[PDB]
Homo-oligomer: A and B are copies of this chain.
Amino acid sequence: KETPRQRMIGILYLVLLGLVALNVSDSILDAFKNLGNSLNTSTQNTQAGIDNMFLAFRETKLKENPERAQPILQKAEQAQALVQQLTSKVGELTTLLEGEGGGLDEETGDVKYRSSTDISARLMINEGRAKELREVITKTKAELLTLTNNEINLTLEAEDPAPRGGIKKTWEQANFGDGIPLTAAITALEKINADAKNAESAVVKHIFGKM
């Protein structure tokens, strides 16, 4: 015989387990992978837009007053190169993290070990690759702002998140740190690439709009 509390417990523990099981989903990681794919496609579109801007400027007002356009074109190309430095750095990091991913899983759609929570923290926090990436982000944002100093680049920013629960986090510990799955880290690198391309588009548009 059991007390009423024991019947309550012995019936509700399975309901609670069902609630807990329902409340945790692999769809978080599927969402991270799909967001990465969408960010990559939109970045391709943004790069196409930048190329169209360059072609437009190249035979709309460059052919008329080159003595005025050559400095503008040179500044735009310099901004392109500055952003490309960060773009290549992020590409190297993405290949590094995907190589240690563990081989693409065709059943899921992305890399195996996509939910490891430790590969990214072992390759970006332990060896400090994330700190170097953050320094590159900050340096390229500052150098982009130097060419304009007028428009504001609300994309390129390695700012630390506002503290919560008394504790404080750094940008590298927030984007690639502990608890971040490998798929989330690859998505974060793709986000940094998209932010760099958006900033490049903004600065190129402003520079070409100066004349």
Contacts and interface: CB of A to CB of B under 8 A. Distances in A.
Interface of A: 2, 6, 9-10, 12-13, 16-17, 19-20, 22-28, 30-32, 34-35, 38-39, 41-43, 45-46, 48-49, 52-53, 56, 107-109, 117, 154-155, 161-162, 164-165, 169, 173-175, 177-180, 184, 187-188, 191, 194-195, 197-198, 201
A169 B22 contact: no
A117 B19 CA distance: 12
Contacts of A174: 25, 27, 30
- Count of this chain's copies in the oligomeric assembly: 2
B155 A41 contact: yes
> Per DSSP, are chain A's interface residues mostly helix, strand or loop, or mixed?
helix
Nearest to A118: B23
A188 B31 contact: yes
